[PDB]
Amino acid sequence: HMLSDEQMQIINSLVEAHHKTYDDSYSDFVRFRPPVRRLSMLPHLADLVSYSIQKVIGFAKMIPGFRDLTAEDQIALLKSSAIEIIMLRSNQSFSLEDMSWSCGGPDFKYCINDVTKAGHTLELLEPLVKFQVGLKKLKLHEEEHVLLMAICLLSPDRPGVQDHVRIEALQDRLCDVLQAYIRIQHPGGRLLYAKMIQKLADLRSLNEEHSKQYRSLSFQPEHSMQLTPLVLEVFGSEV
Amino acid sequence: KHKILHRLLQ
Numbered sequence: 714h715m716l717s718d719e720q721m722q723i724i725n726s727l728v729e730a731h732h733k734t735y736d737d738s739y740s741d742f743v744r745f746r747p748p749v750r751r752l753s754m755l756p757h758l759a760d761l762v763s764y765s766i767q768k769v770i771g772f773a774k775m776i777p778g779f780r781d782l783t784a785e786d787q788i789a790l791l792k793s794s795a796i797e798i799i800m801l802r803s804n805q806s807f808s809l810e811d812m813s814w815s816c817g818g819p820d821f822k823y824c825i826n827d828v829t830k831a832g833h834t835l836e837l838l839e840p841l842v843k844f845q846v847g848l849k850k851l852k853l854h855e856e857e858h859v860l861l862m863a864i865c866l867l868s869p870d871r872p873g874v875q876d877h878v879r880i881e882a883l884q885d886r887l888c889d890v891l892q893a894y895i896r897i898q899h900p901g902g903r904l905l906y907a908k909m910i911q912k913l914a915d916l917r918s919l920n921e922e923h924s925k926q927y928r929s930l931s932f933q934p935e936h937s938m939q940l941t942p943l944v945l946e947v948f949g950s951e952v
Numbered sequence: 953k954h955k956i957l958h959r960l961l962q
């Protein structure tokens with residue numbers, strides 16, 4: 714009926730890790746190659762994604778126990794979850810009012826059309842936007858948002874993980890935190906765990922489609938040359 | 953391999 718000391722500690726360091734890697738001022742965005750509105754927006758969104766990958770790596774290194782996995786597992790976890798964690802963390806700038814991601818100025822407001830001009834087809838965008846709204850409607854507590862990103866990152870069922878048992882144990886402890894938090898701390902949350910765990914299933918499908926689209930870009934050098942080294946390493950198929 | 957990721961992972 715009450716979170717343990719060990720639970721509240723996990724939550725505190727998860728929240729702090731997030732606050733240290735997500736800057737609500739978005740002032741770093743002015744350093745990206747500017748947005749243009751052929752593929753006008755691929756330079757700017759490639760930089761947005763590359764920069765966000767670095768933040769996600771930074772968050773991951775502060776998840777309890779992630780750092781004590783092998784470097785091989787850390788990479789395996791990161792290479793397969795980065796795009797999902799980006800999709801999750803982006804919900805913090807998504808607006809149901811605008812149906813867009815609003816990051817400061819009108820120059821870093823990303824419409825659906827902005828993302829088609831970076832290569833995406835509506836068969837990736839339609840479920841991406843649908844996913845942001847259902848997640849936004851979930852009205853998650855900050856504690857929950859961060860738990861969910863950490864649970865997503867610590868999935869043992871990803872291509873290439875080795876110490877499967879250890880990652881599952883980490884992820885199990887985080888789920889128990891999440892369930893306890895929702896029960897104790899979230900009025901009317903009796904249905905919320907299930908909804909959140911469904912959002913993880915949605916992220917897998919988004920991952921699948923998105924990784925197909927990545928493949929078609931990366932096979933055209935005139936577009937892959939517009940990506941960043943971090944992006945190509947992380948979304949690339951090297952093992 | 954994963955030169956940047958290793959570095960970033962410290």
Ligand SMILES: C=C1/C(=C\C=C2/CCC[C@]3(C)[C@@H]([C@H](C)CC#C[Si](C)(C)C(C)(C)C)CC[C@@H]23)C[C@@H](O)C[C@@H]1O
Pocket residue numbers: 755758759761762765799800802803804805806807814816823828831832833923926927930940944948
């Ligand atoms: C990134 C974040 C933010 C917004 C996220 C957005 C809006 C722009 C388009 C993005 C990036 C999608 C797009 C489909 C991702 C992709 C791809 Si891709 C491998 C085919 C390519 C184009 C080469 C990068 C996925 C998430 C989308 C802002 C802030 O909330 C921080 C957060 O971190």
